[PDB]
Amino acid sequence: SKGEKLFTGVVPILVELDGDVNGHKFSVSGEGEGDATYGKMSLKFICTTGKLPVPWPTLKTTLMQCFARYPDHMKQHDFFKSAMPEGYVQERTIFFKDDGNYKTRAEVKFEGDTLVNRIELKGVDFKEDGNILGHKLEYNAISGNANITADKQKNGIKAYFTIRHDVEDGSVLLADHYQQNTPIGDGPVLLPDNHYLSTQSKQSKDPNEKRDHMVLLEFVTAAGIPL
Numbered sequence: 097s098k099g100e101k102l103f104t105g106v107v108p109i110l111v112e113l114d115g116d117v118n119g120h121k122f123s124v125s126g127e128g129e130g131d132a133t134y135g136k137m138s139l140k141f142i143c144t145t146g147k148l149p150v151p152w153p154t155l156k157t158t159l160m161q162c163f164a165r166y167p168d169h170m171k172q173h174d175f176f177k178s179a180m181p182e183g184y185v186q187e188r189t190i191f192f193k194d195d196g197n198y199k200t201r202a203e204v205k206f207e208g209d210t211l212v213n214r215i216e217l218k219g220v221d222f223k224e225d226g227n228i229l230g231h232k233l234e235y236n237a238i239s240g241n242a243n244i245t246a247d248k249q250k251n252g253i254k255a256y257f258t259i260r261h262d263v264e265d266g267s268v269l270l271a272d273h274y275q276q277n278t279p280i281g282d283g284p285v286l287l288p289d290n291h292y293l294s295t296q297s298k299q300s301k302d303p304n305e306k307r308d309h310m311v312l313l314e315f316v317t318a319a320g321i322p323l
Contacts, residue, residue, distance in 0.1 A: 097178040097286070100171065103132035103162065108210045109139065111159055117219030118196070118229065120149035126159055128312075130211060132177070135165030135316045143308035150219070151233040152310040153261055156297070157273060158188070158200045160213050161242070164293050164316040169323050173288030175244075175253045175277065181206035182281030184252070193270040196222030205280060227263050234262035237299055241292040241319075242275075251285060252278040291320040 111126030128139035141152075141159055148155075162176040176184065183205025190198040202215040222229050242257045255275035260268045279285050298313040 097180070097284075099177040099180040100174060102180050102206065103130070103177055105133075106131050107163075109137065109160065109163075109213070110207075110210050111139070111141065111213045111215070113155070113159060113215040113217060115150075115155075115217040115219070117150050117198070117217070118222045118224070120229075121145070122149055124148070124155065124159065126213075130160065130163035132163045132165060135163065137163050137312070137314040137316070139312040139314070140302065140305075141310045141312070142305075146308070148308050150228055151231055151261075152235060152299075153233050153238065154192070154198070154228055154271070155217075156238050156299075156310075156312070157190070157259060157271075158198065158202070158215060158217055160204060160211065161186075161293055161316065162204060162211065163314075164318050166318040170291065170318050170321050172286055173244075173291055173318065173321065175286050175288055176204075178284075178286035179277075179279040179281065182279070182283065184277045184279055187276045189274045191272040191274075192222075192228060193272070195226050195228055195269070196220055203280065227261075227269050232264045233269065234264060235299065236262055237297045239294075239296050241294055242273075243290070243292050244288060245290050246287040247276065247278075248287060250276070250278050251287070252276065253288065289321065291318055293317070294319050 113124040123144045126141040186202040259271040300311040
């Protein structure tokens, strides 16, 4: 793939999410720029249906691993860019410990020069009085590793990781992520050796924005293969 060639400069990003958590329907739209050369994404997300019925931090992982910086010695392990421009399906289940689960399905592909992430999210079995529907989570940076492995049989990848969400009482809400990505196209893709993506995030508010929103500055770096 000259999949990788589509990411050498700054790429416009569009995100669309339709969600239903315990029957509470909502939509999010996002925009920004990705600069994979520096593993960088600069984003702003809007709840387009009024108030988000779940905390922003619970949606971060759902709301474009194609923008990761793969060091030169690891470029042969970059499935995500290899599937472009036709794109990939990203499916997850996220199990929130002692609470509900999200099931997500996304299509990540180019529409002309724009990288588009279209997402549907279904959440079930949440506690109306719990840390999620009760909005008891810190609005603070998420960082850490996404472990990537080949899925030869599906010509794709699997991923797993646990996110540790800070709770306002000082406890941690564990969110166990199970991920499967498959190419949309039937052209060849790169099936990687085991590695991980290391994400560093800064999250903020726009003081002039009245809509429920989230501003993100993300840096994502492939790692786990030496040299």
